[PDB]
């Protein structure tokens, strides 16, 4: 909000914020509606304080209240405070945009792809007895994923049934400028 | 009685929890800062995670709320075990209880009262383990317990059994006073007190 | 009864001879239920806990939260090397196949002759010498966020079942990539409880 | 130095300028053209 | 040791001791050890079940306070007959004992 | 011999392997095995049925 | 004003016990952030509370001072102002809806329709 | 003097039974801990099963209460075997049927709470003896409404 740094000349350059995933964390085994509602209302406050100053981009994750597979739909129109109904009117979309887990944002002509990170986390969930959890290893895995033109290398652990018909979406068709994981 | 029951319940729960935690009557490792204990709590209070203490306090608060129709004072005592002497006394007044809205305001008042209680408890010296225990005392207007078993109380459901076990679990009995802030809201007119030495 | 072969022996041994479990045609659930009730009666002598356990089991059977592996009659078809245990599943309200439950568009688990004539006879014989009846204990037995939570729990259960079945079939395929779940999707072993849970989750997700 | 010294050096030397609160600075406009164009690729039924 | 006092007397000695007590209880026509018979922990679950079985009357009772009989002095059960008299401005104390500090400590150290 | 020695219900190869050797072996229908054996491609199915029969033979010992 | 601000601060500190932040002072007095920090420092001058101070270093780094004795990289400090005054030891603030109709220093390019 | 007689009888009987059971003067399993209730209290009160000891206790209680005017203190000393030393010495003695009832109830509750927090003692080592008239003293509640106020104290070592 520019209240801490006080350098408005530099803080005003942040056009929008991008929440990539994991905003609410619980164990789906033992949870009730009250805890999720409390966490969503706690998030709603923060949201109501940040919205009228800087735009926001909401993305789901692996521990978010959405589908566990990779192509997660947006959360819902519900699950937020009733005071946010002015933003969910369908007209003010540039201020708050709830998008799927993978997305290719064209920010002023710059194509950037963002993913919740379930693909890399599932690839690292195996133990391959070759190829000789550091930063360089994740970078090399991301580079290999970008070169192979396949966002999801492990089909059954990541992908779900009926993803598409005759044209998979996870196979890369156009290379982006920045790959955000 | 429609909504003040749950509010008074969670208030007494947070009261007992903070009293048990800040006086070192139980190990702090068994307590965790939470906000949901089957009821939305107005503040991140340290609540215990032990089964026996859980339903113990639950039944205590249930009996207190059932007897509220004639109780005007609720006290939590803290006594030593080497000598049966009262060391600390925390009083909660219920003057007419404003008996027979804006839940956020009730939660704010409860939060202010709990903050005042925590500020008062933070000034007390450290309390040691090894049998520094607590008790419970109440003050009613006009009631008599321990005499409902004069007809063998033939039970038929759970309500009668609960009433009997609540009316039979009470036994009759016989410094620097520091006042705190209570709840000045309409329906819940509650006052707070404290005693030492 | 409990056996102590020596005074130094601390834990008892559940020794039974000619117990109600001895039967050519019988369900495994009855044996486990009888063993649990006997253990509860011998350890604490509390009839209220046994009554609560029996009522909980009856309510679970009436709802349909059973694994269906311990609720199957195993008929012996020939070809004497009879090794064809055809499974009857609770009837038709007959003698439905497990494939009917596999395509579980509807449920026919009835709190009926099966439950009654397989549970009340042995418990009644065991508790009449004590002085209590078990039939009366059974006679008394006769939004968006929650939906999303239930859907997520079901999906996580299905994913865990698929993962364990795939790692189980890894013994044969020795592979972890694609077509591994395709090979594991045909395991119809009726002697594995994971298969029943997997097909139940699939039927629940298909409806 | 202590925290008091840093506080007396920072807060006392405050400029208290540019905080008009009536003509605020507008944030840089950044538009994601993929909002309404076509072909949401990962949007399934 | 602890003195009795200035003026005091002494009563007759008990007839039994620590060893002969069980032996005399057995010879009197009673079992040496009375093991716990089947009982209902909940008084609601009683429902007058021990009526009979195959012509054998069984005695099954409960442990709760509502079913327990008062202690008798000389074979006569004593109880209160007159209605209570409620007195204003009374005080009461909770009877059930809370858990022990050592108990919860051992429960936490086991890492359940 | 297993029925004369042990006392169980199913009396199958998988049940015996699980109750004696503590090893659970999957079971496939005859149609699936035939479809796997007649697949020109997907050598994984051939390796699968080969290991299946080899394990069924070794469990007998 | 330095008079109504101190009154509001001591009221919200002792009468209605709750932690006070400079954001509440800015919302109540309709003033800027630097003026709020100056008022907070003046109230800290001329004691039954606990001060919570924050220091903004270089490289856009923000931290919360806890020991108040060992301040690392004292030369790289670009700003250091008292953040809040809490009477209790546990900070644990609370957040609610705030109507910033005229108390905003940076406004978005788009307006709500 | 009508209700107080029988109520003091039953109170003394329960107190003697508790002081015999909670210590090792008599072995366990010889009492009925799951049958009787003393004063509608939720705690368990043990009563011995041997008729001889019950009649002995009743006879001595009747003999005490018959001459309650001349006696002012009734203690129950605990004698230790092979040493003849008084290890413990519990003492007692110097309206509506309800006030004496709750007085006896409170005294019994205090006695139970004080006995339940006692260290374990070895078996076949202590003998009791009733008497008619380094110290750790403990004071319990007593009857205050009746003109025959009964104090309650305990000693040790
Ligand atoms: S279910 Fe079929 S697949 Fe899953 S483990 Fe048991 S056998 Fe192997």
Curated annotation (Swiss-Prot), chain A:
Cell compartment(s), UniProt: Nucleus
Signal peptide segment: none
Taxonomic superkingdom: Eukaryota
Subunit record text: DNA polymerase delta is a heterotrimer of POL3, POL32 and HYS2.
Job description of the protein: DNA polymerase delta (DNA polymerase III) participates in chromosomal DNA replication. It is required during synthesis of the leading and lagging DNA strands at the replication fork and binds at/or near replication origins and moves along DNA with the replication fork. It has 3'-5' proofreading exonuclease activity that correct errors arising during DNA replication. It is also involved in DNA synthesis during DNA repair.
Other facts: Present with 626 molecules/cell in log phase SD medium.
The family this protein is said to belong to: Belongs to the DNA polymerase delta/II small subunit family.
Protein name as annotated: DNA polymerase delta small subunit
Origin species: Saccharomyces cerevisiae (strain ATCC 204508 / S288c)
Residue numbers of the full-length protein present here: 241 to 438 of 487
Swiss-Prot record, chain E:
Subcellular location: Mitochondrion; Nucleus
Domain of life: Eukaryota
Protein purpose: Nonessential DNA polymerase. Required for DNA damage induced mutagenesis. Involved in DNA repair, mitochondrial DNA repair and translesion synthesis. Translesion synthesis in S.cerevisiae may use a specialized DNA polymerase that is not required for other DNA replicative processes. Has a role in the bypass of abasic (AP) sites. Highly inefficient in incorporating nucleotides opposite the AP site, but efficiently extends from nucleotides, particularly an A, inserted opposite the lesion.
Assembly behavior: Forms DNA polymerase zeta with REV7.
Domain notes for this protein: The CysB motif binds 1 4Fe-4S cluster and is required for the formation of polymerase complexes.
Stated family: Belongs to the DNA polymerase type-B family.
Protein name: DNA polymerase zeta catalytic subunit
Organism: Saccharomyces cerevisiae (strain ATCC 204508 / S288c) (Baker's yeast)
Whole-protein coverage range: 513 to 624 of 1504
UniProtKB/Swiss-Prot annotation, chain G:
Domain of life (superkingdom): Eukaryota
Span within the parent record: 1 to 116 of 350
Encoding gene (name): POL32
Coiled coil (residue ranges): none
Role played: DNA polymerase delta (DNA polymerase III) participates in chromosomal DNA replication. It is required during synthesis of the leading and lagging DNA strands at the replication fork and binds at/or near replication origins and moves along DNA with the replication fork. It has 3'-5' proofreading exonuclease activity that correct errors arising during DNA replication. It is also involved in DNA synthesis during DNA repair.
Protein name: DNA polymerase delta subunit 3
Signal peptide (residue range): none
Oligomeric and partner information: DNA polymerase delta is a heterotrimer of POL3, POL32 and HYS2. POL32 can form homodimers.
Localization: Nucleus
Other comments on record: Present with 2410 molecules/cell in log phase SD medium.
From Swiss-Prot, chain H:
Keywords: DNA damage, DNA repair, Mitochondrion
Gene3D superfamilies assigned to the protein according to its UniProt record, in alphabetical order: HORMA domain
Domain of life: Eukaryota
Keyword DNA-binding: no
Record keyword Glycoprotein present: no
GO biological process, alphabetically ordered: error-free translesion synthesis; error-prone translesion synthesis
InterPro entries, per database record: HORMA_dom, HORMA_dom_sf, Mad2-like
Pfam families, sorted: HORMA (PF02301)
Signal sequence residues: none
Chief location bin: mitochondrion
Subcellular localization(s) per the UniProt record: Mitochondrion
PROSITE patterns registered for this protein in UniProt: HORMA
SUPFAM superfamilies, A to Z: The spindle assembly checkpoint protein mad2
Subunit structure: Forms DNA polymerase zeta with REV3. Interacts with REV1.
Family to which this protein belongs: Belongs to the MAD2 family.
Protein name, per record: DNA polymerase zeta processivity subunit
Gene: REV7
């Amino acid at each position: 909000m520019g209240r801490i740094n006080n350098k408005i000349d530099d803080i005003s350059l942040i056009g929008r914020l991008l929440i990539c995933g994991n905003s609410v964390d619980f164990d789906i085994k033992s949870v009730n509606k009250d805890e999720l509602m409390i966490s969503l209302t706690e998030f709603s406050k923060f949201l109501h304080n940040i919205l009228p100053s800087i735009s926001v981009d909401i993305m789901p994750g692996t521990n978010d209240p959405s589908d566990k597979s990779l192509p997660q739909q947006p959360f819902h129109k519900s699950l937020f405070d009733k005071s946010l109904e002015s933003y969910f009117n369908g007209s003010n979309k540039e201020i708050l945009n709830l998008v799927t887990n993978p997305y290719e944002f064209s920010y002023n002509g710059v194509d950037v792809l963002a993913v919740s990170g379930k693909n890399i986390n599932d690839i690292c969930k195996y133990v391959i007895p070759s190829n000789d959890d550091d930063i360089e290893h994740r970078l090399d895995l991301m580079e290999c994923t970008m070169k192979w033109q396949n966002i999801a290398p492990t089909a059954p652990d990541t992908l779900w049934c009926y993803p598409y018909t005759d044209k998979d979406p996870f196979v890369l068709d156009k290379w982006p400028h920045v790959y955000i994981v | 009685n429609r909504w003040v029951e749950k509010w008074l319940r969670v208030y007494l729960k947070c009261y007992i929890n903070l009293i048990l935690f800040y006086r070192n009557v139980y190990p702090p490792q068994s307590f965790d800062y939470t906000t949901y204990q089957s009821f939305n709590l107005p503040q991140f209070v340290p609540i215990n995670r032990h089964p026996a203490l859980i339903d113990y306090i639950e039944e205590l608060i249930l009996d207190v709320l059932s007897k509220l129709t004639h109780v005007y004072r609720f006290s939590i005592c803290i006594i030593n075990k080497k000598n049966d002497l009262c060391i600390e006394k925390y009083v909660l007044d219920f003057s007419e209880l404003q008996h027979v809205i804006t839940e956020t305001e009730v939660f704010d008042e409860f939060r202010s009262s709990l903050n005042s209680l925590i500020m008062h408890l933070e000034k007390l010296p450290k309390v040691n383990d090894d049998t520094i225990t607590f008790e419970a005392v109440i003050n009613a207007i006009e009631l008599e317990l321990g005499h409902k078993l004069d007809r063998n109380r033939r039970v038929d459901s759970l309500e009668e059994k609960a009433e009997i076990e609540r009316d039979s679990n009470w036994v009759k009995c016989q410094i620097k006073l520091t006042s705190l802030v209570g709840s000045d809201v309409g329906p819940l007119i509650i006052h707070q007190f404290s005693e030492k030495l | 009864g409990f056996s102590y072969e020596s005074p130094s022996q601390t834990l008892p041994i559940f020794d039974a001879k000619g117990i109600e479990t001895v039967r050519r045609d019988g369900i495994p659930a009855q044996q486990k239920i009888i063993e649990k009730c006997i253990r509860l009666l011998f350890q604490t002598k509390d009839l209220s806990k046994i009554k609560k356990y029996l009522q909980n089991e009856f309510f679970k059977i009436q709802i349909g939260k059973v694994s269906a592996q311990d609720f199957c009659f195993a008929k012996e078809v020939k070809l004497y090397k009879e090794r064809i245990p055809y499974l009857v599943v609770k009837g038709k309200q007959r003698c439905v196949s497990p494939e009917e439950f596999l395509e579980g568009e509807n449920l026919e688990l009835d709190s009926e002759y099966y439950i009654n004539k397989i549970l009340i006879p042995p418990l009644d014989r065991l508790f009449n010498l004590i002085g209590i009846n078990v039939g009366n204990w059974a006679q008394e037995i006769v939004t968006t966020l929650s939906f999303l939570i239930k859907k997520l729990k079901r999906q996580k259960e299905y994913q865990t079942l698929k993962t364990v079945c795939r790692t189980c079939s890894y013994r044969y395929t020795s592979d972890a990539g694609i077509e591994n779940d395709h090979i594991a999707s045909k395991c119809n072993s009726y002697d594995c409880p994971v298969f029943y849970s997997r097909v139940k989750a699939e039927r629940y997700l298909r409806d | 130095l202590h925290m008091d010294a840093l506080l007396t050096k920072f807060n006392e030397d405050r400029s208290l300028q540019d905080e008009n609160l009536s003509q605020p600075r507008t944030r840089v406009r950044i538009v994601d053209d993929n909002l309404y164009n076509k072909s949401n690729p990962f949007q399934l039924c | 040791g602890l003195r009795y006092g200035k003026r005091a007397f002494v009563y007759g000695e008990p007839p039994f001791g620590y060893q002969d007590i069980l032996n005399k209880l057995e010879d009197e026509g009673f079992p040496k050890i009375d093991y716990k018979d089947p009982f209902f922990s909940n008084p609601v679950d009683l429902e007058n079940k021990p009526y009979a079985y195959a012509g054998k009357r069984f005695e099954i009772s409960s442990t709760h306070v509502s079913t327990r009989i008062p202690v008798q002095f000389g074979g006569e059960t004593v109880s209160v007959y007159n209605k209570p008299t409620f007195d204003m401005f009374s005080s009461w104390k909770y009877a059930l004992k809370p858990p022990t500090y050592d108990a919860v400590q051992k429960w936490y150290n086991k890492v359940p | 011999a297993l029925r004369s020695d042990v006392n169980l219900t199913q009396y199958t190869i998988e049940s015996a392997a699980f109750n004696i050797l503590h090893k659970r072996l999957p079971h496939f229908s005859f149609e699936s095995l035939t479809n796997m054996w007649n697949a020109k491609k997907s050598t994984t199915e051939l390796k699968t049925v080969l290991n299946y029969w080899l394990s069924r033979a070794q469990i007998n010992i | 004003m330095d008079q109504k601000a101190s009154y509001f601060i001591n009221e919200k500190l002792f009468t209605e016990v709750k932690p006070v932040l400079f954001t509440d002072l800015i919302h109540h007095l309709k003033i800027g952030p630097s003026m709020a920090k100056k008022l907070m420092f003046d109230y800290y001058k001329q004691a039954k509370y606990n001060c919570v101070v924050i220091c903004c270093y270089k490289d856009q780094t923000i931290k919360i001072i806890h020991d108040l004795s060992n301040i690392p990289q004292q030369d790289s400090i670009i700003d250091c102002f008292i953040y809040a005054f809490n009477p209790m030891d546990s900070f644990i603030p609370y957040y609610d809806i705030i109507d910033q109709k005229d108390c905003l220093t940076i406004k978005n390019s788009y307006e709500l329709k």
